[PDB]
Design a protein around this ligand. Structure first.
Ligand SMILES: CCCCC/C=C\C/C=C\CCCCCCCC(=O)O[C@H](COC(=O)CCCCCCCCCCCCCCC)COP(=O)([O-])OCC[N+](C)(C)C
Ligand SMILES: CCCCC/C=C\C/C=C\CCCCCCCC(=O)O[C@H](COC(=O)CCCCCCCCCCCCCCC)COP(=O)([O-])OCC[N+](C)(C)C
Ligand SMILES: CCCCCCCCCCCCCCCCCCCC(=O)O[C@H](COC(=O)CCCCCCCCCCCCCC)COP(=O)(O)OCCN
Ligand SMILES: *[C@@H]1O[C@H](CO)[C@@H](O[C@@H]2O[C@H](CO)[C@@H](O[C@@H]3O[C@H](CO)[C@@H](O)[C@H](O)[C@@H]3O)[C@H](O)[C@H]2NC(C)=O)[C@H](O)[C@H]1NC(C)=O
Ligand SMILES: *[C@@H]1O[C@H](CO)[C@@H](O[C@@H]2O[C@H](CO)[C@@H](O)[C@H](O)[C@H]2NC(C)=O)[C@H](O)[C@H]1NC(C)=O
Lengths: 85, 162, 120, 236, 61, 34
């Protein structure tokens, strides 16, 4: 019903955003420093020398952390340059 | 189509006079690798002497030979492992070539911004800083207001853009 | 030998990047040194002047690399101040690089009249 | 095509017009001399051809653009609430012109959170923005909800010809993609069809954070792919 | 070469980031000033041939 | 979008950071190599 959805529309709150667009490139830069420090220190855990199981362990936990900071960073840096989502 | 020397200074700032000294410095310890750089310098320097689009194959060997001469100078004048006279001389000879490396950036960005960054479609003749897009106006008239199998006989140097 | 082929091929490079064949193909004439405010065209002694310029900066580069141990002994017989004399001599070689490179960008400034880095 | 976006909190309008001028055609062809003298004589009264278009946009519109097929057009003027447009050639009687305009509104005034559930949104979209004197022979209104949205209810004030729900992959749509809810209206008037399309959907936070987690899944499997290609011995 | 190789590897990587930034950002004086469009009379056919490749098959290209 | 003077400042600062860290790499390499 268009009238039920019209009443249900005009009696509602507005969209309160999660993170605004004007603070979001700063999250992109700080997130780039975080995931670049974590992933930049992740290729040297496989890089220098170790055993195998500790190299696998620290590589996979540090690659999980740097990978999720990388994904959230490129969402915010996607929204910063003009394209959205 | 021969070319004059201000295109040689214009396209490469200070690499044009490290280009021969790199070759002469690549003779004095002549491995089998360096015969390629010498022949690729002597040959393609002739071809860019005769033509103008053969400057484009000359451009990499100017960078390689300038990079071997400048790293020989920086090789024997960044050895910081003493005495204040030699240290003062090493700073006054390294700090000159660092200054040319910084001048190369401002030259290479001024030349790019002025002489090689312009559209071939928008024609800013300023008949006032006015832009002119009569080519896209007319060609988009042909795209919009003509039957899609009409044949357009223009002169040949505008043949692709149509 | 090796140095003679080096000097012949390097001098060939000097004569080619100083645009000798624009003076060979396009028959140019001399009037009175340079063509001011005219980028494309060339006088026939400008090739000779630029051979002097490019040749002397390349010569100062190779003196500045493999010419410092040879001129600290040929020009001064003593050995007690080797670092002092060859240090000063390398510094003067850098100074002549700066002078002749200013004598390159000055000539390019009188060729192309609006050049914002004349280095003088 | 409109594009709802919960991460940017913005709605993004893009419109593709294929307009003709059904006025009287002009005899003796077209001559720029008579047109330019007709401009230089007086005042540009009311006549047939099209020189400028007045696009009436929603209230706060930010990033205006106006392109043709071959490139962009620089003769456009985006003043407050009004987007003026000059095409490349003046559209005389019978001539065609296909162009594209676009702008960007904030989402806080087109989208409204429902009351019963926090993760259920209701959007009301302006059905038609354009010049004040136009008649639309075909309209297809594609609204694009984000990747995890699920449409519950659909209401339109104008009786449409068609409606369908598809998906379409835009930038960083690693999974199935945006939910393309597309309406097909046939015969509309610019002045008459004052309406808003009401979509009621949900968009839970389980699917709101799956975008950076999906991009994190590709970066993670790429780097474990790097680990397999560096613990592997190939030395003959 | 205990610590030195790591520091020279990091310097080499930051060097190629600066080289790619200088080698991309110095090209874009005509795209950012006017528009991204194909220039200078010849690559309109290369662009139309690439459009033919991406709309149709490679066997048809 | 970025302007043209700001792109000129971006291109020049990538050039200066580029040549600066090249010279730093060559100094650290030429001092501490056998
Ligand atoms: C290798 C490490 C990362 C390397 C990073 C390299 C470069 C980043 C630096 C600068 C680039 C940003 C400049 C954007 C220019 C304006 C955009 C535009 O205007 O063009 C866009 C093209 O969109 C793009 O391409 C997206 C570019 C996104 C770049 C953001 C950074 C992400 C980098 C990727 C990281 C790895 C990915 C992993 C995925 C699994 C045209 O959009 P449209 O015509 O459809 O407009 C209408 C839009 N509707 C359709 C919504 C209405
Ligand atoms: C190989 C390494 C590559 C090195 C660099 C390569 C290319 C650089 C050359 C040119 C770039 C110039 C940009 C031209 C376009 C202008 C747009 C513009 O300037 O955006 C500016 C702001 O931007 C910024 O704050 C930049 C934010 C931080 C940048 C982060 C870097 C991206 C990389 C992240 C990838 C992480 C994943 C890791 C994967 C391992 C705004 O513009 P607007 O008003 O149009 O936005 C539309 C209006 N809102 C604001 C409402 C939306
Ligand atoms: C050294 C040079 C070796 C040359 C080998 C020739 C390979 C030709 C690849 C052309 C790819 C291409 O045409 O692009 C489109 C994408 O291709 C695709 O649909 C699949 C992408 C092709 C992936 C192949 C990997 C390329 C790397 C080549 C390395 C070979 C080295 C050998 C030692 C064509 O696709 P379409 O429009 O026709 O698609 C629908 C038809 N099915
Ligand atoms: C710009 O938009 C206009 C408006 O839609 C497009 O015009 C349409 O183009 C198609 C194909 O060129 C025409 O179909 C033709 O119909 C005639 C009979 O009417 C037939 O003889 C042809 O074989 C073809 O099927 C269509 O009539 C025409 N519409 C109008 C109102 O003229 C135009 O193609 C678009 N141009 C570009 C460059 O996208
Ligand atoms: C109503 O819209 C649907 C879209 O779902 C149309 O169906 C598509 O029609 C195209 C023809 O151009 C086919 O290629 C697709 O396969 C169809 N999709 C489906 C799911 O059927 C349909 O034709 C439209 N009907 C009318 C009367 O406009």
């Amino acid at each position: 019903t268009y009238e039920q959805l019209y009443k249900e529309f005009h009696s509602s709150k507005s969209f309160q955003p999660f993170i605004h667009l004007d603070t979001q490139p700063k999250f992109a830069i700080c997130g780039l420093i975080v995931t670049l420090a974590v992933l930049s220190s992740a290729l040297f855990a496989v890089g220098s020398k170790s055993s195998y199981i500790k190299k696998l362990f620290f590589y996979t936990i540090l690659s999980v952390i740097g990978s999720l900071f990388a994904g959230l960073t490129t969402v915010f840096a996607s929204n910063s340059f003009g394209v959205y989502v | 189509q021969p070319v004059s020397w201000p295109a040689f200074f214009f396209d490469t700032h200070f690499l044009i006079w490290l280009f021969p000294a790199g070759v002469f410095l690549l003779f004095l310890d002549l491995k089998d690798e360096h015969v390629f750089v010498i022949a690729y310098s002597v040959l393609c320097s002739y071809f860019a002497g005769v033509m103008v689009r053969l400057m484009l194959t000359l451009t990499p060997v100017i960078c390689v030979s300038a990079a071997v001469a400048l790293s020989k100078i920086f090789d024997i004048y960044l050895d910081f492992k003493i005495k204040p006279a030699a240290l003062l001389a090493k700073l006054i000879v390294s700090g000159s070539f660092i200054f040319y490396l910084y001048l190369f950036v401002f030259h290479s960005t001024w030349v790019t911004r002025t002489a090689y960054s312009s559209p071939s479609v928008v024609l800013p003749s300023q008949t006032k800083l006015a832009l002119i897009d009569d080519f896209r106006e007319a060609y988009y008239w042909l795209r919009m207001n003509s039957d899609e199998d009409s044949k357009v006989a223009a002169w040949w140097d505008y043949g692709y853009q149509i | 030998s090796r140095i003679i082929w080096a000097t012949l091929s390097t001098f060939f490079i000097i004569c080619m990047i100083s645009a000798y064949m624009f003076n060979q193909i396009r028959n140019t004439q001399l009037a009175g040194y340079f063509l001011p405010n005219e980028f494309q065209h060339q006088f026939a002694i400008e090739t000779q002047v630029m051979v002097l310029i490019y040749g002397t900066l390349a010569a100062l580069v190779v003196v500045l690399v493999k010419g410092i141990q040879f001129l600290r002994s040929h020009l001064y017989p003593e050995t007690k101040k080797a670092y002092f004399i060859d240090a000063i001599l390398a510094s003067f070689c850098a100074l002549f690089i700066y002078v002749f490179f200013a004598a390159l960008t000055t000539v390019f400034t009188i060729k192309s009249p609006a050049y914002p880095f004349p280095l003088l | 095509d409109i594009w709802l976006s919960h991460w940017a909190s913005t709605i993004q309008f893009e419109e593709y017009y294929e307009l003709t001028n059904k006025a009287a055609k002009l005899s003796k062809g077209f001559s720029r001399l008579e047109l330019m003298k007709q401009i230089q004589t007086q005042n540009m009264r009311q006549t047939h051809f099209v020189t400028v278009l007045d696009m009436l946009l929603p209230e706060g519109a930010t990033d205006h653009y106006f392109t043709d097929l071959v490139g962009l057009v620089s003769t456009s003027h985006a003043e407050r609430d009004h987007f003026f447009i000059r095409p490349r050639f003046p559209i005389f009687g019978g001539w065609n012109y296909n162009f594209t305009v676009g702008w960007t509104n904030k989402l806080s005034d087109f989208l409204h959170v429902s009351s019963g559930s926090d993760e259920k949104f209701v959007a009301s979209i302006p059905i038609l923005n354009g010049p004040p004197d136009t008649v639309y022979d075909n309209v297809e209104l594609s609204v694009f909800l984000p990747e995890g949205a699920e449409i519950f209810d659909i209401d339109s004030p104008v009786p449409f010809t068609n409606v369908s729900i598809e998906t379409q992959k835009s930038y960083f749509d690693l999974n199935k993609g945006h939910v393309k809810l597309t309406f097909s209206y046939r015969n509309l008037i610019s002045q008459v069809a004052n309406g808003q399309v009401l979509i009621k959907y949900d968009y839970p936070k389980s699917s709101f954070f799956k975008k950076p987690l999906s991009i994190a899944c590709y970066i993670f499997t790429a780097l474990m792919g790097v680990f397999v290609l560096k613990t592997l011995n190939m030395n003959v | 070469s205990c610590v030195l190789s790591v520091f020279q590897t990091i310097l080499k990587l930051v060097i190629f980031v600066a080289i790619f930034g200088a080698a991309i950002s110095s090209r874009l004086f005509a795209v950012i000033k006017f528009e991204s469009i194909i220039h200078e009379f010849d690559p309109w056919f290369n662009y139309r041939a690439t459009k033919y490749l991406v709309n149709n098959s490679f066997y048809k290209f | 979008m970025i302007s043209d003077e700001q792109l000129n400042s971006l291109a020049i600062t990538f050039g200066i950071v580029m040549m600066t860290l090249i010279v730093i790499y060559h100094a650290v390499d030429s001092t501490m190599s056998p």
